[PDB]
Write a protein that binds this DNA or RNA. Structure first.
Ligand code: MG
Ligand code: MG
Ligand code: MG
Ligand code: MG
Ligand code: MG
Ligand code: MG
Ligand code: MG
Ligand code: MG
Ligand code: MG
Ligand code: MG
Ligand code: MG
Ligand code: MG
Ligand code: MG
Ligand code: MG
Ligand code: MG
Ligand code: MG
Ligand code: MG
Ligand code: MG
Ligand code: MG
Lengths: 117, 151, 51
RNA sequence: GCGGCCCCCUGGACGAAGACUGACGCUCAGGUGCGAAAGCGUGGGGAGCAAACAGGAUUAGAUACCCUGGUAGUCCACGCCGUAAACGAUGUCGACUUGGAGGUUGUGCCCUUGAGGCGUGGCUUCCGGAGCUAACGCGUUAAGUCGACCGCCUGGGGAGUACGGCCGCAAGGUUAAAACUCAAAUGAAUUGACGGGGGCCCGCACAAGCGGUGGAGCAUGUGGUUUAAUUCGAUGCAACGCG
């Protein structure tokens, strides 16, 4: 439809769920998928396998997309932070740079208290 | 066991046919310790299957056993929480024995005429893939690939 | 943070990310509530490290 | 008690020799000052976090642990409060007493070749000798040998409570009893046992399989009940086809 011919995939991976969204360099989202929405409701959605399933499910259908080269950037503590890439790269888009954001707060915003369980 | 390695001797090959697998099949099919009845029943079913399918005698059952053997099995595992169905790799001999047990129990649950014909029917429907052994066989395949990270 | 791999990368094997801290800083920072804890997390193992 | 960086004001400590005063010192009841966090008053600010509070879970119950929100508070200025396991559970000052390995910060001599040799101070961590100690342990930074002064203790509970005095806006703080009751309370260490502590190992313990019991009929024993009597024993595993 637009034939971007290049893009970047933002992965937000946490201990609870994984989200993957394809986007343009100018911050324009085309599609997204989540392990929770990929039929892994419960404890499996936090597993690496459900992350790669969502990655490939979001990467599929490249015809209308048109993104040939798809960079990658991950954020947060994921289920290895590598399985999603292992699936996405084989999905068809070659990877040349992966950046990791993982926002590290330089102090401030006192974290929540501890869990006594 | 827990400390000493074990291993069982190999049963005698099946009479006349010389099929070690057939000799093991009569062992599994044996009930109350009567090899005569098991041998008669297995031979009756084998000849019935051969004449019904038009196939040879040795490999007619081999095809069905090949087509009713699984690849992975779920083992109940719970490291930190509740039970997790963790699929595992099946050993060769374990695969063979499991398929054999599946065939025998599937023939057991039938009610066609008698063991001689029920075993032949099970072999035929296993060759075709429309029996009950195959119906139970696809379950492990569908339940595989659940929890890899756990061990 | 960034990978600049040579033209031959095989199947895109991550060799430099693995050698880097990977999750050094990530694991260091993902913890919480650094107020009453540090006063007591202190060496004393270094002491046990002896012949 | 104090951690981004920069500026202004300002206190203390340590090293080099040199000069100067000439016991001017140590300790300190009462007194004065400082003093975490929480808390209080007035006026601001309020992103995150979070007492109270609300809801959802778990549970026999849960006004708790868990989850979703969330006010005071946490922040700032000026005042008050004066309490902490405010601990090194070890008052300050001075002298003497074998060593070893480190850290941090000065300084002297030298073939100075070097991220080197040889010395001399301040602070600081660990291990250990004599000695001391109930023991654990301390050990030149003493809990060793001595000297000066101060503070405090006299069985456990009642009780750091009551009354009185002083202080505070309040919460409360400080000083501080008696009646009554018990024969103990307590410290260190030893052996064993136990732990929803850790490590290693074994058993048909689990797992992988076969066959069972618990369902039906019957045999037998036991409990219970009834009976003239239903003789007496045996009772988790280790009594119940047992004597
Ligand atoms: Mg949370
Ligand atoms: Mg005084
Ligand atoms: Mg305060
Ligand atoms: Mg206030
Ligand atoms: Mg206010
Ligand atoms: Mg809460
Ligand atoms: Mg006090
Ligand atoms: Mg303190
Ligand atoms: Mg302390
Ligand atoms: Mg004291
Ligand atoms: Mg010592
Ligand atoms: Mg009082
Ligand atoms: Mg009073
Ligand atoms: Mg045995
Ligand atoms: Mg078992
Ligand atoms: Mg019965
Ligand atoms: Mg008697
Ligand atoms: Mg009796
Ligand atoms: Mg008796």
């Amino acid at each position: 439809r637009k034939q971007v011919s290049d893009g970047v995939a933002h992965i937000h991976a946490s201990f609870n769920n994984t989200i993957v969204t394809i986007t343009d360099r100018q911050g324009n989202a085309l599609g997204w998928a989540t392990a929770g929405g990929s039929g892994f409701r419960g404890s499996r959605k936090s597993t690496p396998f459900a992350a790669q399933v969502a990655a490939e499910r979001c990467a599929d259908a490249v015809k209308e997309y048109g993104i040939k080269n798809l960079e990658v950037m991950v954020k947060g503590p994921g289920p290895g932070r590598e399985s999603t890439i292992r699936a996405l790269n084989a999905a068809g888009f070659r990877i040349t740079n992966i950046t990791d954001v993982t926002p590290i707060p330089h102090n401030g915003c006192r974290p929540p208290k501890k869990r006594r369980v | 066991p827990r400390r000493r390695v074990i291993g069982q001797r190999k049963i005698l090959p099946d009479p006349k046919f010389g099929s070690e697998l057939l000799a093991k099949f009569v062992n599994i099919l044996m009930v109350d310790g009567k090899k005569s009845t098991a041998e008669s029943i297995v031979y009756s079913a084998l000849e019935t299957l051969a004449q019904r399918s038009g196939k040879s005698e040795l490999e007619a059952f081999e095809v069905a056993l090949e087509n009713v053997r699984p690849t992975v099995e779920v083992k109940s595992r719970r490291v930190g929480g509740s039970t997790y169905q963790v699929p595992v790799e099946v050993r060769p001999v374990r695969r063979n024995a499991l398929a054999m047990r599946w065939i025998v129990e599937a023939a057991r649950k039938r009610g066609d005429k008698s063991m001689a014909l029920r075993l032949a029917n099970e072999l035929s429907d296993a060759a075709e893939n429309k029996g009950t052994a195959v119906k139970k066989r696809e379950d492990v395949h569908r339940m595989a690939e659940a929890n890899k990270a756990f061990a | 943070i960034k990978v600049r791999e040579n033209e031959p990368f095989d199947v895109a094997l991550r060799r430099f990310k693995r050698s880097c801290e990977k999750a050094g800083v990530l694991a260091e920072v993902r913890r919480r509530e650094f107020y009453e804890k540090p006063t007591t997390e202190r060496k004393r193992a270094k002491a046990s490290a002896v012949k």
